[PDB]
């Protein structure tokens with residue numbers, strides 16, 4: 084495990100300001116602009132428990148780990164060609180460890 | 192006795208490379224000043240700044256516009272319509288210290304182009320040569336449009352900027368960026384979810400959200416969705432007017448066409464009132480930071 | 486598309502002479518029922534009634550206004566903001582029986598025009614063609630303004646009625662008429678001494694009376710003078726706001742200017758929301774009872 088861990092306090096702050104518009108975390112949470120992110124560290128992204136992805140997501144079959152998730156959050160419009168996630172990207176490495184630490188606990 | 196002509200004069204011995212450095216400096220600061228306005232960044236406020244310095248233009252007597260950089264003076268800086276833009280001015284203020292040769296109008300307009308491109312919008316060709324004019328050339332307050340209006344007001348206002356229906360609806364797509372702030376404009380809330388990435392979601396939200404006319408805490412009325420988005424009355428008029436509605440559907444369905452139309456209309460907006468000489472350089476298209484390896 | 490449009494439709498086979506007879510019917514009853522409200526008469530309540538049926542308009546979606554005559558329905562009739570207006574509805578009910586061809590909105594708005602003219606106010610041009618609309622068209626309660634407010638509330642409220650500062654201050658001069666009744670609104674007292682003659686006394690009293698903030702028997706605060714007059718918080722705001730204050734001084738100095746400005750603002754208020762066809766007749770200017778030897 085080479086991925087640095089951070090504080091979930093500022094990770095919670097980053098998710099509610101840069102992710103909450105499109106994602107929820109809670110068990111049974113509704114889908115918004117983006118799909119529900121409960122149990123994202125269990126299997127692959129696309130399909131989900133419902134929701135209609137595009138033709139680029141479901142075909143790559145990446146099991147979200149703690150660094151490829153970190154890679155995707157840096158420049159999403161790069162790792163996969165044809166994603167609907169319009170995100171500017173977390174550039175600051177200290178922003179990317181806090182959020183994943185908060186995300187690996189809120190998603191159980 | 193004379194006609195009102197604003198002739199563009201390139202900064203002494205400056206070329207594409209000089210202005211790319213300024214672009215790069217603005218774009219780097221946009222990248223690193225990430226916390227502003229609850230992590231929206233300075234992208235949207237710079238776009239609004241570029242439109243507010245340009246939106247004072249009047250085609251009937253060729254007053255206003257981006258040419259003079261008159262937003263730096265007291266009268267324009269204090270226009271109630273420009274409330275909140277002081278943050279964009281403070282943003283570019285150190286960049287002007289870094290590049291003291293660039294004019295105020297060029298810097299204000301380049302900041303809007305940089306913001307659009309760095310928020311993954313279309314490439315926007317940009318021309319230099321705006322010249323700082325004296326304080327007596329500052330347009331009086333009242334030239335920028337009001338949000339509590341209908342489609343007929345929107346149509347007739349942008350006629351003053353020589354903009355037609357297609358350019359109006361395209362330019363309004365910039366409201367996918369940022370948010371209204373109650374303390375600035377009497378309206379509170381964003382227009383969409385991805386408010387620092389340039390997309391066509393303004394048109395998708397207009398068409399697909401369930402909108403309800405509601406009061407806000409400033410006693411003003413706005414359209415609100417259950418998703419927590421809002422639309423100004425002037426925004427909502429684009430789907431009340433049948434000619435505007437036709438264009439809104441076109442852009443909601445084809446982001447590429449919207450990007451092409453916005454690029455033309457936005458460059459046209461930043462250049463209203465400027466007469467470029469015959470020996471004037473071709474418009475610059477700047478590289479993004481990503482295209483430069485960052 | 487097309488949001489809701491209220492097209493004026495002249496009552497079948499009715500012309501100017503017919504409405505002058507209705508004006509005369511209302512105007513004579515105002516002369517004979519001169520005992521109401523300690524000999525103030527029905528003049529002021531008919532003016533308030535016409536403003537309250539028009540003041541429900543919302544320019545943003547074109548709902549409300551005088552067109553549909555929906556004050557006759559239970560929801561609007563029982564609006565807390567309309568407490569006391571039942572006396573105006575009952576005043577007009579027999580007149581409506583005499584001329585059952587006139588629409589509800591036409592009679593309500595004509596009552597206000599008749600009352601202003603018969604109280605020696607300015608002539609108010611009046612257009613016919615309002616058409617009674619179904620009960621579902623009734624606007625929900627809460628569109629009418631609250632008294633317990635300041636100038637910013639007043640300015641923002643009247644923007645919803647497409648009224649500017651000059652129209653607001655002018656329309657507010659109608660508080661020269663009548664009085665507040667504690668049982669109706671939670672405020673008590675007249676604004677002036679000549680409260681059944683239309684004058685500029687409202688602006689004179691605002692500027693010439695010493696006002697002191699005081700709680701009334703309803704636990705509401707109002708501005709009171711030693712001579713026995715009162716001002717609502719929203720009235721007194723007209724001298725707390727600097728742009729309002731300059732217009733108050735204008736009307737206090739020139740009643741004829743106030744008369745001209747009120748006539749235009751009042752007709753505009755009574756016609757908000759109504760689309761008049763291209764071949765619509767010119768506004769009627771009715772003769773008073775005095776001009777007819779009565």
Ligand code: HEM
Nearest residue numbers: 101102105116117128129136137140166167168170384385
């Ligand atoms: C903000 C910090 C943020 C995070 C974190 C995040 C996570 C995330 C993941 C893990 C996925 C993949 C889900 C899967 O494999 O099923 C994903 C995908 C989408 N996102 Fe996202 N997301 C963040 C930010 C945002 C924002 C701000 C938006 C919208 C404005 C957004 C939207 C979306 C969408 C849509 C998808 C689906 C991708 C597709 O269908 O191709 N996200 N996000």
Ligand code: HEM
Nearest residue numbers: 235236238239242337338362365368369370371372375376
């Ligand atoms: C009828 C036309 C327009 C009206 C009435 C209008 C009105 C407004 C208002 C009231 C705000 C709120 C500002 C705040 O509260 O902070 C705003 C913000 C904004 N405007 Fe518009 N605008 C119009 C056209 C445009 C155009 C043509 C552009 C660009 C091409 C634009 C770009 C923006 C942006 C990016 C913001 C977000 C600012 C921020 O988040 O800091 N607008 N506008």
Ligand code: HEM
Nearest residue numbers: 529530532533536630631632656659663664665666669670
């Ligand atoms: C902010 C705007 C306004 C507020 C808050 C307001 C409020 C009030 C209140 C509280 C009363 C007392 C009612 C009672 O106790 O019986 C009243 C009376 C009255 N209002 Fe206003 N009003 C406003 C604007 C207007 C306008 C625009 C007009 C006409 C053009 C008008 C005409 C009248 C009249 C004539 C009366 C006297 C009614 C009577 O004596 O029976 N008002 N108003």
